[PDB]
């Protein structure tokens with residue numbers, strides 16, 4: 001009755017963050033069946049309009065960019081290699097396109113790229129993964145035996161990789177209440193280390209979605225949300241909660257503003273079936289954007305952290 | 320010794336899969352170019368490309384200013400590769416940058432133009448595969464150099480797609496041994512074969528300490544000459560170039576052994592010495608993009624750390 005009122009509205013994810021724009025394409029036609037209201041301003045310059053229900057993507061993007069998104073329409077979810085660098089046809093404006101699939105639909109998140117970054121996209125993708133891979137080797141070379149030193153290491157490595165003001169390891173107890181068991185902040189900041197938080201601060205609906213979306217980013221909790229519009233011929237709502245752009249629930253948004261955490265990056269810590277052990281939670285006291293390549297690299301660092309956590313659990317229950 | 324080093328340094332030949340420019344460390348103008356650079360970068364007064372060419376006339380403006388930026392950064396701060404576009408064609412290359420005394424050296428490796436959208440994605444996937452391989456090396460139980468080496472050649476085989484991958488160990492007398500090997504089915508195994516120290520001379524062994532990954536696309540390809548301004552106050556070395564051509568003796572050696580292509584990773588243990596090489600061979604030509612060779616560099620460093628540990632745990636017990 002509480003899980004199903006939150007879950008219905010998050011799963012539809014009809015409100016996005018304005019740092020990016022969203023398209024949904026029909027797998028058969030390759031045409032637009034849903035768009036964020038900012039997508040026309042972001043992807044075109046202001047018949048048809050340039051961008052609505054039925055728009056062909058050969059009108060929006062340069063020919064190699066349109067052809068790579070058309071080819072993505074033929075791949076299993078698991079075989080998608082993100083992100084795709086696309087260019088808009090008129091402006092030459094660049095974006096990272098992040099693709100995911102929901103049955104016959106292909107959902108694209110567009111995150112702008114500074115045009116001076118275009119030449120360095122492979123270079124910066126490699127550097128982000130290298131730095132994460134080095135963090136992985138420091139986690140592996142720790143002596144076994146201490147959940148505390150493993151979590152301290154992780155928040156130190158994530159703090160240096162992501163540049164956020166605060167990074168904590170947030171553990172879920174048996175009763176679903178949480179505890180901050182590791183923490184590093186910049187010098188001004190109030191410490192949360194060792195505090196315990198009620199289960200209802202993180203409802204089951206968010207818990208469920210972190211099993212599937214392993215990295216969630218909120219750029220600015222005070223940003224004006226943007227509405228996604230869908231094809232009126234669809235007799236159900238599209239599921240958009242897989243979007244990197246999904247807006248926080250208004251209650252979480254206020255919770256963030258309350259706590260002076262304007263921005264956040266959260267990585268799911270899933271142990272082997274599967275359990276959500278906890279979250280790696282990064283906060284910023286001002287707005288913050290990190291590009292897809294670095295959030296991708298963080299996914300893998302978080303999966304390796306999950307493996308080491310689960311081994312420290314097995315070495316608790318032995319000894 | 321100094322006869323091999325003169326010819327692999329000063330030789331001035333590159334492999335034709337790419338082209339080379341050297342730019343003066345202050346003017347940022349061309350002081351050396353491979354003879355294929357004009358056709359490959361311009362679609363062949365002044366010509367479009369010679370000694371003195373300004374890079375602003377060869378590449379689009381964002382491409383030229385990403386190179387101008389590298390000109391002001393220490394070798395240690397260089398993030399490779401830069402994606403560049405040629406000015407009229409829009410033809411794209413990976414530009415791999417390294418510094419010598421007077422100069423910035425750029426290796427240009429072609430990118431299929433319809434693959435430009437997938438460059439970041441392909442780079443992340445190459446590193447992710449290598450990162451997964453790293454976690455499989457670390458989760459091995461200690462005690463077995465054989466299991467350590469078998470794993471490495473299996474991970475390198477699945478990452479690079481070559482016909483054959485071997486771990487080649489240097490003995491105390493510098494002769495080599497194939498101690499691990501994975502091939503595609505139907506190939507003769509070279510596992511356990513011992514080869515003389517002269518098959519890999521000191522010269523090559525020295526240079527693998529500095530250049531950790533070396534690719535030869537086709538041992539039969541026609542080498543292309545690098546031309547420099549004869550007034551340049553030093554000789555350009557190409558030892559650091561990804562494009563450097565193999566000595567004609569190695570190229571014959573490869574053809575004899577039915578390895579038309581190779582990819583070799585130095586295994587350096589701690590002072591430092593060259594423990595061995597991870598050697599990939601192919602029966603036909605093979606090109607692998609820079610991101611994948613870069614990710615193999617890190618995988619090979621990590622393998623070297625675990626090799627070194629199995630050595631210390633042998634000395635113990």
Ligand SMILES: *[C@@H](C)[C@H]1/C(=C/c2[nH]c(/C=C3N=C(/C=C4\NC(=O)C(CC)=C4C)C(C)=C\3CCC(=O)O)c(CCC(=O)O)c2C)NC(=O)[C@@H]1C
Nearest residue numbers: 197200201202203206216247248249251252255264266281
């Ligand atoms: C309002 C009705 C109730 C509520 C709702 C709510 N919470 C979330 C999600 C999250 N809540 C937290 C909580 C914390 N962040 C912290 O830093 C700390 C201190 C350590 C806590 C306790 C977190 C991390 C999340 C995940 C949010 C993310 O995506 O980064 C949601 C889901 C929001 C969404 O749309 O994702 C909701 C609806 N929270 C309350 O406190 C009220 C009781």
Ligand SMILES: *[C@H](C)[C@H]1/C(=C/c2[nH]c(/C=C3N=C(/C=C4\NC(=O)C(CC)=C4C)C(C)=C\3CCC(=O)O)c(CCC(=O)O)c2C)NC(=O)[C@@H]1C
Nearest residue numbers: 327514517518519520523533564565566568569572581583
């Ligand atoms: C010619 C007069 C002599 C010679 C010279 C030579 N060898 C190399 C470099 C390499 N040689 C090997 C040898 C092997 N490759 C194999 O697959 C095997 C079987 C396991 C062996 C023993 C290798 C791996 C290299 C590295 C080549 C590379 O750079 O990828 C060189 C250097 C070539 C260059 O220009 O870099 C030279 C000059 N080889 C002979 O057999 C003659 C005695």
